[PDB]
Design a protein around this ligand. Sequence first.
Ligand code: AHN
Ligand code: ZN
Length: 292
Amino acid sequence: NVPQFDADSAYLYVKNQVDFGPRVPNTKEHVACGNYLAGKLEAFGAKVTNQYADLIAYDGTLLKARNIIGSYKPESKKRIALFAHWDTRPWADNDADEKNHHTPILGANDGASGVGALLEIARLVNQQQPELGIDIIFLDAEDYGTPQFYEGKHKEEAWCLGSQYWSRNPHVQGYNARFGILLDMVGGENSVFLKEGYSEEFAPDINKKVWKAAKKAGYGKTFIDERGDTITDDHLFINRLARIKTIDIIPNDPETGFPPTWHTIHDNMDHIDKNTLKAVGQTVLEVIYNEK
Ligand SMILES: CC(=O)NCCc1c[nH]cn1
Ligand SMILES: [Zn+2]
């Protein structure tokens, strides 16, 4: 019996994060939201480990980062890692309107959606424990990468600073997981998810498992069994540095690639659909509960 993901509950966790305002590293709203997330994990029975680190951004800015890890059955050596980034981008640098290019986004889909879905998973995992140990890992400073308008070097390593840190410095010595699943932008209206490129390179068997689970759960029209783009995201560094086979569940829009709200001021609750959260969340539950 796999638990039923509650879309209303997940939607509320997304909204609560967005209600702090932008979660830009080094702002009081970021601090407050981090406290909220750590608090929710504790309330859902997780052992919480905080990883505070001074991460240096593309331009030399020190970011007071905090990765947040909630662990279930922590003494188990057979584990599944679930990841989402919780920071939000400080510049709406893909906005159609050039006047918005320096305005922080709300990151309802890009940030809050992955975290919200994993909080709902954590609530259920607490209630009805799967066989494997589950880690819920909220990664900071994913989205402080080089602005589009920057003229100069655009290095891949500017992104995903928190996952790079976690991947080099696991929260517990000897950490291992059977596989990982990263959720990024999993609440957008009308979103479809295709097999992402690095996911196919490092963990094609995990992609196969997830997409098959989605079909069996009735979400085959949301998880389309075709390949999409190759995307620099937290899973790239987790695969390369931590060597945990990790896939990215991330939308592919045929027109725009990313969702049309991506890195615009329109990434807010108006474009979140709880049915998208449900498709992704139920699929993740179906996978983790069927591991033995
Ligand atoms: C190809 C690319 O620029 N990816 C940026 C990482 C990211 C941010 N938000 C979602 N994905
Ligand atoms: Zn982003």
